[PDB]
Design an enzyme around this catalytic site. Structure first.
Site, PDB file in Angstrom:
ATOM      1  N   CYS A 133     -45.851  41.456 -48.677  1.00 12.50           N
ATOM      2  CA  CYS A 133     -46.248  42.010 -47.386  1.00 12.50           C
ATOM      3  C   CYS A 133     -47.238  43.195 -47.525  1.00 12.50           C
ATOM      4  O   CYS A 133     -46.827  44.349 -47.755  1.00 12.50           O
ATOM      5  CB  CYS A 133     -45.010  42.487 -46.639  1.00 12.50           C
ATOM      6  SG  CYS A 133     -45.446  43.171 -45.031  1.00 12.50           S
ATOM      7  N   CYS A 136     -46.680  46.009 -44.926  1.00 10.38           N
ATOM      8  CA  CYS A 136     -45.482  46.809 -45.173  1.00 10.38           C
ATOM      9  C   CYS A 136     -45.749  47.823 -46.272  1.00 10.38           C
ATOM     10  O   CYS A 136     -45.411  48.994 -46.129  1.00 10.38           O
ATOM     11  CB  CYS A 136     -44.295  45.930 -45.594  1.00 10.38           C
ATOM     12  SG  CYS A 136     -43.962  44.490 -44.550  1.00 10.38           S
ATOM     13  N   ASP A 137     -46.365  47.380 -47.362  1.00  7.11           N
ATOM     14  CA  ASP A 137     -46.440  48.212 -48.559  1.00  7.11           C
ATOM     15  C   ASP A 137     -47.848  48.652 -48.978  1.00  7.11           C
ATOM     16  O   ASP A 137     -47.979  49.478 -49.886  1.00  7.11           O
ATOM     17  CB  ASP A 137     -45.724  47.498 -49.704  1.00  7.11           C
ATOM     18  CG  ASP A 137     -44.228  47.320 -49.431  1.00  7.11           C
ATOM     19  OD1 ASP A 137     -43.561  48.317 -49.051  1.00  7.11           O
ATOM     20  OD2 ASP A 137     -43.724  46.186 -49.587  1.00  7.11           O
TER      21      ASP A 137
HETATM   22  C1  LIG Z   1     -39.103  41.612 -48.458  1.00  5.26           C
HETATM   23  C2  LIG Z   1     -39.595  41.781 -47.020  1.00  5.26           C
HETATM   24  C3  LIG Z   1     -40.079  43.026 -46.596  1.00  5.26           C
HETATM   25  C4  LIG Z   1     -40.533  43.191 -45.286  1.00  5.26           C
HETATM   26  N1  LIG Z   1     -41.031  44.439 -44.853  1.00  5.26           N
HETATM   27  C5  LIG Z   1     -41.263  44.669 -43.499  1.00  5.26           C
HETATM   28  C6  LIG Z   1     -41.532  45.946 -43.000  1.00  5.26           C
HETATM   29  O1  LIG Z   1     -41.615  46.949 -43.721  1.00  5.26           O
HETATM   30  N2  LIG Z   1     -41.750  46.069 -41.620  1.00  5.26           N
HETATM   31  C7  LIG Z   1     -41.677  44.994 -40.758  1.00  5.26           C
HETATM   32  O2  LIG Z   1     -41.857  45.106 -39.550  1.00  5.26           O
HETATM   33  N3  LIG Z   1     -41.424  43.743 -41.244  1.00  5.26           N
HETATM   34  C8  LIG Z   1     -41.216  43.578 -42.615  1.00  5.26           C
HETATM   35  N4  LIG Z   1     -40.934  42.286 -43.082  1.00  5.26           N
HETATM   36  C9  LIG Z   1     -41.054  41.148 -42.173  1.00  5.26           C
HETATM   37  C10 LIG Z   1     -39.802  41.054 -41.288  1.00  5.26           C
HETATM   38  O3  LIG Z   1     -38.645  41.185 -42.136  1.00  5.26           O
HETATM   39  C11 LIG Z   1     -39.788  39.698 -40.583  1.00  5.26           C
HETATM   40  O4  LIG Z   1     -41.058  39.526 -39.874  1.00  5.26           O
HETATM   41  C12 LIG Z   1     -38.624  39.630 -39.588  1.00  5.26           C
HETATM   42  O5  LIG Z   1     -37.378  39.744 -40.270  1.00  5.26           O
HETATM   43  C13 LIG Z   1     -38.629  38.314 -38.804  1.00  5.26           C
HETATM   44  O6  LIG Z   1     -37.432  38.245 -38.006  1.00  5.26           O
HETATM   45  P1  LIG Z   1     -36.885  36.883 -37.459  1.00  5.26           P
HETATM   46  O7  LIG Z   1     -35.639  37.179 -36.726  1.00  5.26           O
HETATM   47  O8  LIG Z   1     -37.920  36.093 -36.761  1.00  5.26           O
HETATM   48  O9  LIG Z   1     -36.526  35.975 -38.805  1.00  5.26           O
HETATM   49  P2  LIG Z   1     -35.636  36.326 -40.074  1.00  5.26           P
HETATM   50  O10 LIG Z   1     -35.602  37.750 -40.372  1.00  5.26           O
HETATM   51  O11 LIG Z   1     -36.093  35.355 -41.116  1.00  5.26           O
HETATM   52  O12 LIG Z   1     -34.169  35.937 -39.544  1.00  5.26           O
HETATM   53  C14 LIG Z   1     -33.753  34.547 -39.420  1.00  5.26           C
HETATM   54  C15 LIG Z   1     -32.219  34.476 -39.493  1.00  5.26           C
HETATM   55  O13 LIG Z   1     -31.751  33.158 -39.140  1.00  5.26           O
HETATM   56  C16 LIG Z   1     -30.835  32.705 -40.126  1.00  5.26           C
HETATM   57  N5  LIG Z   1     -30.933  31.195 -40.152  1.00  5.26           N
HETATM   58  C17 LIG Z   1     -31.976  30.461 -40.526  1.00  5.26           C
HETATM   59  N6  LIG Z   1     -31.685  29.178 -40.398  1.00  5.26           N
HETATM   60  C18 LIG Z   1     -30.430  29.087 -39.933  1.00  5.26           C
HETATM   61  C19 LIG Z   1     -29.590  28.037 -39.598  1.00  5.26           C
HETATM   62  N7  LIG Z   1     -29.991  26.770 -39.725  1.00  5.26           N
HETATM   63  N8  LIG Z   1     -28.362  28.327 -39.132  1.00  5.26           N
HETATM   64  C20 LIG Z   1     -27.960  29.600 -38.993  1.00  5.26           C
HETATM   65  N9  LIG Z   1     -28.727  30.627 -39.298  1.00  5.26           N
HETATM   66  C21 LIG Z   1     -29.965  30.388 -39.767  1.00  5.26           C
HETATM   67  C22 LIG Z   1     -31.321  33.330 -41.422  1.00  5.26           C
HETATM   68  O14 LIG Z   1     -30.176  33.437 -42.280  1.00  5.26           O
HETATM   69  C23 LIG Z   1     -31.809  34.718 -40.961  1.00  5.26           C
HETATM   70  O15 LIG Z   1     -30.761  35.703 -41.005  1.00  5.26           O
HETATM   71  C24 LIG Z   1     -40.494  42.115 -44.408  1.00  5.26           C
HETATM   72  C25 LIG Z   1     -40.014  40.861 -44.828  1.00  5.26           C
HETATM   73  C26 LIG Z   1     -39.563  40.704 -46.146  1.00  5.26           C
HETATM   74  C27 LIG Z   1     -39.048  39.331 -46.608  1.00  5.26           C
END
Ligand SMILES: Cc1cc2nc3c(=O)[nH]c(=O)nc-3n(C[C@H](O)[C@H](O)[C@H](O)COP(=O)(O)OP(=O)(O)OC[C@H]3O[C@@H](n4cnc5c(N)ncnc54)[C@H](O)[C@@H]3O)c2cc1C
Ligand SMILES: Cc1cc2nc3c(=O)[nH]c(=O)nc-3n(C[C@H](O)[C@H](O)[C@H](O)COP(=O)(O)OP(=O)(O)OC[C@H]3O[C@@H](n4cnc5c(N)ncnc54)[C@H](O)[C@@H]3O)c2cc1C
Ligand SMILES: NC(=O)c1ccc[n+]([C@@H]2O[C@H](COP(=O)([O-])OP(=O)(O)OC[C@H]3O[C@@H](n4cnc5c(N)ncnc54)[C@H](OP(=O)(O)O)[C@@H]3O)[C@@H](O)[C@H]2O)c1
Ligand SMILES: NC(=O)c1ccc[n+]([C@@H]2O[C@H](COP(=O)([O-])OP(=O)(O)OC[C@H]3O[C@@H](n4cnc5c(N)ncnc54)[C@H](OP(=O)(O)O)[C@@H]3O)[C@@H](O)[C@H]2O)c1
Lengths: 310, 310
Positions: A133, A136-137
């Site tokens: 990312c 982020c970093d």
């Molecule tokens: C290492 C890392 C660092 C990051 N740093 C930043 C940062 O500094 N600032 C920032 O804003 N963003 C950051 N991001 C990006 C941010 O984390 C994501 O954009 C955000 O989490 C997206 O949220 P979401 O709810 O759409 O999906 P996700 O966070 O991917 O959540 C999806 C959830 O659904 C669950 N799931 C999936 N499929 C199923 C299923 N079939 N049944 C039940 N549950 C399921 C998964 O277990 C997960 O918990 C970072 C991401 C990563 C990986």
């Protein structure tokens, strides 16, 4: 039956649950494979969530979302959703354990995951300088040298981007040819702050107690080894969209997706299926930030509320 | 000249400045009349911002955004913008203090303004029982009685929404006839939890340290007066987006708006003008929530960063 089934408990799903329940949806269920929080819980530091001044781990950042988003009646199902299907004017949610649930409306909030490499040191230094990312970093590496791994549009685009903040960018790719567009490759070739290292592989990500200090890289053709001294290593070797729950028994998709498998939505987070909404990293043009995912969740919940009224 | 001029210091502009500057934009300037924070500072309580568990006033909620969003070199211009124009490949920002600023890109984050009635008590109880946002404040009046003011689609739609949360909704309007869509009136007229009070005017909004406690109303047909004892009073007498800065000397508009003046944007927060972006309550289909505005700002800033690359 369930009024709104929210599939996925990251920021999108949690925000949708907060908004849906605080908006009067009496039977909202958040389905989550594990502990909610989502992708951010794998990060050692988040500092760019508007309104949260304290710098803390992703896990600590998400901890208070649990009490808040469940404060207004949201229910939990700790289960792995296998499929979501349309049945008449409702939805059938099949879990991996064999249980079936029925819901009037569904928000798909399953996110995605940057692809990893398994390069030696990747796990140990994940989050101290091995990043997936640049937004982020990137800021930490102002006026410093960084490396970017990959040969697709994302790698080359983020290389161009980091080239505007960092002293120098090493663009590492295992082939002379790039998958990215010719126009963006041309731009990268013209950027004097980008040094193309091809055809190269990264054999080890080296670091301290603190973390990444250098990359042990190898020219795959000549086997010449080089230590690239950089405290920042950005990996862009693809992205997995978690759209498995959309796949029906006959292999069709529940709703319209783009060529990459991301869910098509409008500004209300509606799909092309009545009663079906999506939110977060799963949807088209997601910026991939927590605040953006949370906003999608809120939007999708607001649309659910209007849907369930009508 | 300025790399990016951000017009408005509510959550959208603040989030835009945080992302822009943390993304390496070297000369980003936030234009704001008075102190950043935007509309939410008028509220005595926000609790639905995902990730912020404390229940606090809007002013207290926004205070940490100041240090956070300015942590990375964002500059503050303490003046109201009169006009944004495009000149060749840049923008001219005419400020009310008569200064002109040039910028390579602009993010319009000027928000909007609910119309006010000027009824005795409105100013005093604004954000303390007087609300223009049912999603924001409805949950407080769960199982209680509330009043709604107005006769358009918004008032009647929100009366219907609130009737699913509250015990009773009094729908107060100064004429027997309504401007809303016929089917909306029909639904409202046949909802047992909505009591129509027409043709009525609210003469005073009365209350105490806790907030609103009653409304003095008058039946303009019969001249008789009543006191409605309700802790919540929702006003929907119109809304104006703050699009004045788009108005050109020749009477054209800087960029495409919808029929109500909201700025048209795509999922990247791009307008139809190169280098011009918009975020928050100013843009089409804005849900009008802090998290949504903050997300838009983040998105616009990322688009700005991309734009400035080439
Ligand atoms: C290492 C890392 C660092 C990051 N740093 C930043 C940062 O500094 N600032 C920032 O804003 N963003 C950051 N991001 C990006 C941010 O984390 C994501 O954009 C955000 O989490 C997206 O949220 P979401 O709810 O759409 O999906 P996700 O966070 O991917 O959540 C999806 C959830 O659904 C669950 N799931 C999936 N499929 C199923 C299923 N079939 N049944 C039940 N549950 C399921 C998964 O277990 C997960 O918990 C970072 C991401 C990563 C990986
Ligand atoms: C009574 C009330 C209660 C609310 N409660 C909640 C709640 O509980 N939860 C929630 O999420 N949302 C709530 N909201 C909504 C939320 O406040 C808005 O959606 C959000 O503030 C929009 O952010 P923004 O940055 O787009 O616009 P704004 O907050 O309107 O900020 C725009 C800023 O730009 C400035 N500006 C305008 N024109 C110019 C110019 N020409 N030059 C310079 N500066 C300019 C304005 O002064 C303002 O500071 C509430 C709103 C109200 C009215
Ligand atoms: N605005 C835009 O136009 C835009 C921006 C971003 C993304 N996209 C779209 O999204 C897709 C791009 O995906 P994206 O780059 O994330 O990834 P994607 O194209 O798969 O490309 C992945 C790249 O990483 C390399 N790679 C994969 N696994 C690796 C490993 N284990 N070790 C080392 N290298 C590895 C691949 O090498 P090989 O080539 O040798 O297989 C490839 O160069 C494209 O279809 C593009 O259209 C578009
Ligand atoms: N789902 C939808 O399609 C949808 C939803 C919401 C809004 N909209 C549209 O968005 C636009 C805005 O409409 P909206 O209802 O906010 O407002 P809008 O139609 O102006 O309606 C305002 C209402 O407020 C009343 N009013 C104005 N000032 C007042 C005052 N000082 N005291 C008491 N009453 C006062 C007006 O009374 P009078 O009638 O006597 O003038 C009118 O009934 C409209 O075009 C509307 O149709 C569409």
């Amino acid at each position: 039956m369930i009024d709104c089934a929210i599939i996925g408990g990251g920021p999108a799903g949690l925000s949708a649950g907060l908004y849906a329940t605080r908006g009067g949806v009496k039977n909202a269920v958040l389905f989550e494979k594990g502990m909610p929080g989502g992708q951010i819980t794998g990060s050692s530091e988040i500092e760019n969530y508007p309104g949260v001044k304290e710098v803390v781990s992703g896990l600590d950042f998400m901890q208070p979302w649990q009490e808040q988003c469940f404060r207004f009646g949201l229910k939990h199902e700790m289960t792995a959703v296998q499929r979501v299907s349309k049945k008449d004017s409702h939805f059938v949610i099949l879990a991996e354990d064999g249980k079936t649930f029925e819901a009037k409306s569904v928000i798909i909030a399953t996110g995605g995951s940057p692809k990893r490499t398994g390069i030696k040191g990747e796990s140990e230094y994940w989050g101290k300088g091995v990043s997936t990312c640049a937004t982020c970093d990137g800021f930490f590496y102002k006026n410093k040298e960084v490396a970017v791994l990959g040969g697709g549009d994302t790698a080359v685009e983020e290389a161009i981007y980091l080239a505007n903040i960092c002293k120098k960018v090493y663009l590492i790719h295992r082939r002379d040819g790039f998958r990215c567009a010719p126009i963006t490759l041309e731009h990268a070739k013209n950027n004097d702050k980008i040094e193309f290292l091809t055809p190269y592989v990264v054999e080890e990500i080296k670091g301290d107690a603190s973390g990444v200090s250098s990359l042990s890289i190898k020219n795959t053709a000549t086997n010449e080894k080089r230590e690239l001294v950089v405290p920042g290593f950005f990996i862009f070797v693809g992205y997995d969209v978690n759209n498995a729950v959309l796949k029906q028994e006959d292999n069709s998709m529940l709703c319209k997706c783009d060529e990459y498998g991301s869910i098509v939505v409008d500004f209300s987070m509606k799909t092309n299926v009545q009663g079906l909404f999506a939110a977060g990293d799963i949807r088209i043009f997601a910026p991939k930030q927590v605040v953006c995912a949370a906003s999608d969740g809120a939007t999708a919940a607001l649309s659910v509320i209007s849907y369930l009224e009508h």
